[PDB]
Design a protein around this ligand. Structure first.
Ligand code: PLP
Ligand code: PLP
Lengths: 453, 451
C-alpha cells in the first residue's frame, strides 16, 4: 500500500467530499520551512494561508520547537482541575490579560476555537442563571460568520455548509445580516447607511425576540472563513450602541484577527470594539500546538465565580485545558511576535500585498479587492456590473485556487473569493512572489473564461 | 507577584470553586518523572490518577518527547482539510483501524474527547438525514455517564455537576439507569436480574419515545469519572440485543478504557461490546498531546460519504484535527504500549492493586471496593448497613482525597469514592505505596469522623 492508498483506506477528511477523496486521493505534505511547505513529490508551495490562517511564525520556528522540548522534559502533561496549576498556563494567562485591548479579568483555556466558543455559550448561560436572569440565553451572530463546528458553535456559525444536514442551528441561536457592502448594500447605499440598516435590523431582531431573552452578540471583527469581509465604516460603533442599550454582551471572536493579522495586535483595536469576552486561537501558538483562550471581563468572571461557589465547583473543563506544552509554546510564540515587532512588520507587508493585488482592480473578472493588515481577498465575478458569477457561484474561486497550487501557492477559495493570510514573517520579496503567483493563476483563469468585451 | 498570586489574578480554573481558589490559590505542579509529580515546594506525589486517567507511560517517557521533536523539525503544523494529508495522521489512522476490536472503516481526528462525542452526535444526525430518517435523532446515555463538556457532549454526560446552571441536557438527549448494583439493585437481586431490569428499562424507554426517533446508545464500557462503575454480568450482552432489535447505533466511549486500562486493549474486549462507533483519547497520547479519535464502521462511513458528496463536502473539522505533532506522539505511544507488553503488565499490576485494596473490605467506613484491570475505586459511607453518607454525599470523599495528597498521593474524589487509575508503567512496590497512602488517608478519615 502507498501512503496515499492508506490515506484513502483509513481517513475520513474534514471539509472534504469523501467520495471525490476516494477517486483523487490526498495531496500529502511532507515538510515545511519558513513560509513554504513541500509535498511528497518534492514540489514547494508558498503557504499563502499560513495553513489555516494560523502559522504566524511559519513552518520551522526553532524557538517554538525548543520551548516544547524544554516543557516536555519538565512536565509533559498536567491539568488545571481542582486548584492544580503550572507555570506555563500562569505566565501565558498573565501575558494575555496584560496585553488585552480592554480591561480583562481572567483566562480560561481550551484546545480549539470551537470548544472556546462552545464554552462561552455555557459561561453566558451559567452567568445569566447566577444573576437571576434565566430567560436571558439567546445568541445573535451573522450570516457567513464562522465560530467553529461543535453543535453549539456551528449554531453561532452563519455558513450554511456548516449547518445543512446537521439539523443546525439549535433554537435560541439567531442570525442577522452579513456586513458585506459589495454583496448586501442597496444600489447607491453608503457604507454608513448600510451600517444604519444593519443596526436597525439588530435592534428590530432584539425587540421581536424580547430584549430580556437576548444574552450575547458574537462577531469576528472582520470575517475570515466567510470571505475576508471588512465591515462597513461605523458598523461596530452602531452595533455596540444597540448591544449596550439592551444589556447584551459583545463577544469578539479574534481566532483569526488575534496577534497582528489586521494591522494592530487585535481586530478589536483595528475596528474599535470594546468586547466583554474575547476568543483567541490559531496564531496564539502559530498552530504548533492545539490551544485556544477565552478572556472574560470582571462582570462575567464575578457572576461565574459566585455560582461556582454556590454549586460546589465550576462543572466544566477539558483534559487538555491549559496543557503545559501548548501553553509553553503559545507563551514563546507571543514573546517572538513582540520581540520581532511582527505587528508593525505585518502591517507593512499587508500594504505591499494590497498594492500588488490592486494592479488588477480594472480586470474584467475582478469584482472586489478587500482586506486590511496582512489579510486580503480577491473576489472574482463573471460580470462586474451585475456581480454575477461565471457559470455556478464558486467556479472561478475553485479554478483560481487550482491554478495557484500548480504555480506553487496554496490559497483558499471562499465561493469566488481567493484568500491571503500569509505567515507574519513573510518578507517583501515573498509578498512579490505571492502576488506573481496570484497573477499567473488569474492569467490562466482569464484564458480559460475568455471574457472578450 | 508570586506565581501563586499571578494564578489567582489571571486564571479561571476548570472544576474549581473560583471563590475558594481566590482564598487558597493553586497547588503548582513544577515537574514530573515516572509515576511522580512534584509541587513548587519540592514535595513528590504518586499521580495515582495518571493526571486525568490519561498518562499511560508516566511523566518522563523520552520516546514520546523525541517523536514530537522529530515531527516538529519536519512539519510542525498542517491540516487535513480539502484532501490535504500528512504521514503521521495516515499511519496513526492505519494503526487504529488495524488494532480495532471489531471491523472499522475510517478514523476522524479531534483534539478532545468532548469534541469527539460532539462530532459523533453531528455524524449520526448527518447519517440519518442522508438515509431519509429525519426523526431518528435522539441519543440515550446513562445516569453518571461522563462523555465530556460541550453543550452536546455535557447533554450525553449523566452527572448533574456537568448540567446544573448550564441549562442542560438539550432536548433529545435521554438517560437510563446507572448500572451500579451496590446503589440501584433491589434487595437480594442478582447481577443477571439487575441486568434484565436495565435491559427492560432501555426497551421501555425506546418504545415510550418511539423507536423510529432513537438514533444511538452511548456508554463507557465501565464508567470512569462517574465512580469507576463496573456493569453487572450480562449487562452489555442484553443492552446490545435491545439496541440491535430497534436498529440503534452502539457507541463505545473508550476515552478512559482504551489502551490497556481494563485488562485488555479495549473495554469493548473486556465487556464483549461490538460497537458501531468508538471514541478514543487520554491514553491515546498519554495526554502528552491533545488528541482524540473516532472509529466509524463501514455503514456509518458509507452514509456520511454519500451525504458529503450530495452536500459538496463534509462541513466539519477542527484546525487541530489530526495535528501532525499530536498524531506522531500518539502513534509512538501505541507502539510503546505494544512493544513493552503494557496491557499484560497493567493487568498484573491491577490484580496487585485490587488485592491490596481488598484488605480494607471490613473497614467500618468502606461501603464498596470496585474495579477491573488497573482502574479501581473505594467508596466510603457513614453507615455500611444504610449506605448513608457522613453529613452529606461528598464529605468523606473530599476529606479522603485531601489526606491522600498530604500523604504524597493524588487521587480524585467522585462523591464519597476515591479513584485509582495509575500509569500503566507502575511497578509492584509502587502499587504497594499507592495502597499504603490510601490506608494512611483512610486512618486519618476514620479518626476525623471519630466516635
Ligand atoms: C478557526 C476558527 C474557529 C474555530 O477554531 P477551531 O480550533 O478550528 O475549532 C472559530 N472562530 C473563528 C473566527 C475561526 O477562524
Ligand atoms: C475525559 C473523558 C471525555 C472527555 O475528554 P476531554 O478531552 O476531557 O474533552 C469523554 N469521555 C470519557 C469517558 C472521558 O473519561
Amino acid at each position: 500500500s502507498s501512503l496515499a492508498e492508506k490515506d484513502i483506506q483509513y481517513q475520513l477528511h474534514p471539509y472534504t467530499n469523501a467520495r471525490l477523496h476516494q477517486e483523487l486521493g490526498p495531496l500529502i505534505i511532507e515538510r515545511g520551512q519558513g513560509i513554504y511547505v513541500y509535498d511528497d513529490q518534492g514540489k514547494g508551495y508558498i503557504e499563502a494561508m499560513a495553513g489555516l490562517w494560523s502559522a504566524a511564525l511559519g513552518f520551522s520556528n526553532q524557538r517554538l520547537i525548543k520551548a516544547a522540548e524544554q516543557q516536555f522534559n519538565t512536565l509533559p502533561f498536567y491539568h488545571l482541575f481542582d486548584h492544580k496549576s503550572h507555570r506555563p498556563s500562569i505566565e501565558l494567562a498573565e501575558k494575555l490579560i496584560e496585553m488585552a485591548p480592554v480591561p480583562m479579568s481572567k483566562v480560561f483555556f481550551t484546545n480549539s476555537g470551537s470548544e472556546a466558543n462552545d464554552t462561552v455559550v455555557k459561561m453566558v448561560w451559567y452567568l445569566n442563571n447566577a444573576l437571576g436572569k434565566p430567560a436571558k440565553k439567546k445568541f445573535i451572530s451573522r450570516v457567513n460568520g464562522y465560530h467553529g463546528v461543535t453543535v453549539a458553535s456551528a449554531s453561532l456559525t452563519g455558513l450554511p455548509g456548516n449547518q445543512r444536514g446537521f439539523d443546525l442551528p439549535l433554537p435560541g441561536f439567531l442570525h442577522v445580516g452579513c456586513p458585506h457592502h459589495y454583496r448586501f448594500a442597496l444600489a447607491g447605499e453608503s457604507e454608513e447607511h448600510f451600517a444604519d440598516r444593519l443596526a436597525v435590523e439588530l435592534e428590530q431582531k432584539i425587540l421581536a425576540e424580547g430584549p430580556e431573552t437576548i444574552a450575547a452578540f458574537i462577531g469576528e471583527p472582520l470575517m475570515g472563513a466567510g470571505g475576508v469581509i471588512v465591515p462597513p465604516r461605523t458598523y461596530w460603533e452602531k452595533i455596540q450602541k444597540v448591544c449596550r442599550k439592551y444589556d447584551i454582551l459583545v463577544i469578539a471572536d479574534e481566532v483569526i484577527c488575534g496577534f497582528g493579522r489586521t494591522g494592530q495586535m487585535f481586530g478589536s483595536q483595528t475596528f474599535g470594539i470594546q468586547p466583554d469576552i474575547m476568543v483567541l486561537s490559531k496564531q496564539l501558538s502559530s498552530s504548533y500546538q492545539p490551544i485556544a483562550a477565552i478572556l472574560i471581563n470582571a462582570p462575567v468572571f464575578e457572576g461565574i465565580a459566585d455560582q461556582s461557589q454556590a454549586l460546589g465547583a465550576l462543572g466544566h473543563g477539558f483534559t487538555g485545558s491549559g496543557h503545559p506544552v501548548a501553553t509553553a509554546v503559545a507563551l514563546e510564540n507571543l514573546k517572538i511576535i513582540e520581540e520581532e515587532s511582527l505587528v508593525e512588520h505585518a502591517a507593512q507587508m499587508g500594504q505591499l500585498l494590497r498594492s500588488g493585488l490592486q494592479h488588477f482592480i480594472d480586470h474584467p473578472l475582478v469584482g472586489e479587492i478587500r482586506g486590511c493588515g496582512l489579510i486580503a481577498a480577491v473576489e472574482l465575478v463573471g460580470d462586474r456590473v451585475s456581480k454575477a458569477p461565471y457559470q455556478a457561484l464558486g467556479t472561478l474561486g475553485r479554478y483560481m485556487a487550482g491554478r495557484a497550487q500548480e504555480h506553487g501557492m496554496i490559497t483558499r477559495a471562499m465561493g469566488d473569493a481567493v484568500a491571503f493570510c500569509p505567515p507574519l514573517i513573510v518578507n517583501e520579496q515573498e509578498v512579490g512572489m505571492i502576488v506573481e503567483r496570484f497573477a499567473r493563476a488569474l492569467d490562466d483563469t482569464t484564458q480559460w473564461v475568455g471574457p472578450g468585451g
